[PDB]
Amino acid sequence: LFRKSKLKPFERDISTEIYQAGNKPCNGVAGPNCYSPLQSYGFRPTYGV
Amino acid sequence: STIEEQAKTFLDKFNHEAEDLFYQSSLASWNYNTNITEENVQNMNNAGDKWSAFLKEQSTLAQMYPLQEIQNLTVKLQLQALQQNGSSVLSEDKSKRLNTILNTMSTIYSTGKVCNPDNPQECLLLEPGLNEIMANSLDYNERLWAWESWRSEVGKQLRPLYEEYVVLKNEMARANHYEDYGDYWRGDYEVNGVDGYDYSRGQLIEDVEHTFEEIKPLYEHLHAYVRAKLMNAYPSYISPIGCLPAHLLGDMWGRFWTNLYSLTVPFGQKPNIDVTDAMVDQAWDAQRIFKEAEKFFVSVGLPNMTQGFWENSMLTDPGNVQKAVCHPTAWDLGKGDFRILMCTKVTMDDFLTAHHEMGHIQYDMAYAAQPFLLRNGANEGFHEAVGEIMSLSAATPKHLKSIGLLSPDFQEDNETEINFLLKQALTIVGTLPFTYMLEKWRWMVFKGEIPKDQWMKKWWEMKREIVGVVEPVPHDETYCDPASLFHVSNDYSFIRYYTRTLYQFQFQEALCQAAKHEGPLHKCDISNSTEAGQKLFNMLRLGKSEPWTLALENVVGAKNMNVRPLLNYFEPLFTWLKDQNKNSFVGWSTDWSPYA
Ligand SMILES: *[C@@H]1O[C@H](CO)[C@@H](O[C@@H]2O[C@H](CO)[C@@H](O[C@@H]3O[C@H](CO[C@H]4O[C@H](CO)[C@@H](O)[C@H](O)[C@@H]4O)[C@@H](O)[C@H](O[C@H]4O[C@H](CO)[C@@H](O)[C@H](O)[C@@H]4O)[C@@H]3O)[C@H](O)[C@H]2NC(C)=O)[C@H](O)[C@H]1NC(C)=O
Ligand SMILES: *[C@@H]1O[C@H](CO)[C@@H](O[C@@H]2O[C@H](CO)[C@@H](O[C@@H]3O[C@H](CO)[C@@H](O)[C@H](O)[C@@H]3O)[C@H](O)[C@H]2NC(C)=O)[C@H](O)[C@H]1NC(C)=O
Ligand SMILES: *[C@@H]1O[C@H](CO)[C@@H](O[C@@H]2O[C@H](CO)[C@@H](O)[C@H](O)[C@H]2NC(C)=O)[C@H](O)[C@H]1NC(C)=O
Ligand SMILES: *[C@@H]1O[C@H](CO)[C@@H](O)[C@H](O)[C@H]1NC(C)=O
Ligand SMILES: *[C@@H]1O[C@H](CO)[C@@H](O)[C@H](O)[C@H]1NC(C)=O
Ligand SMILES: *[C@@H]1O[C@H](CO)[C@@H](O)[C@H](O)[C@H]1NC(C)=O
Question: Where does chloride bind (chain B)?
Answer without folding.
Answer: 151, 459, 463
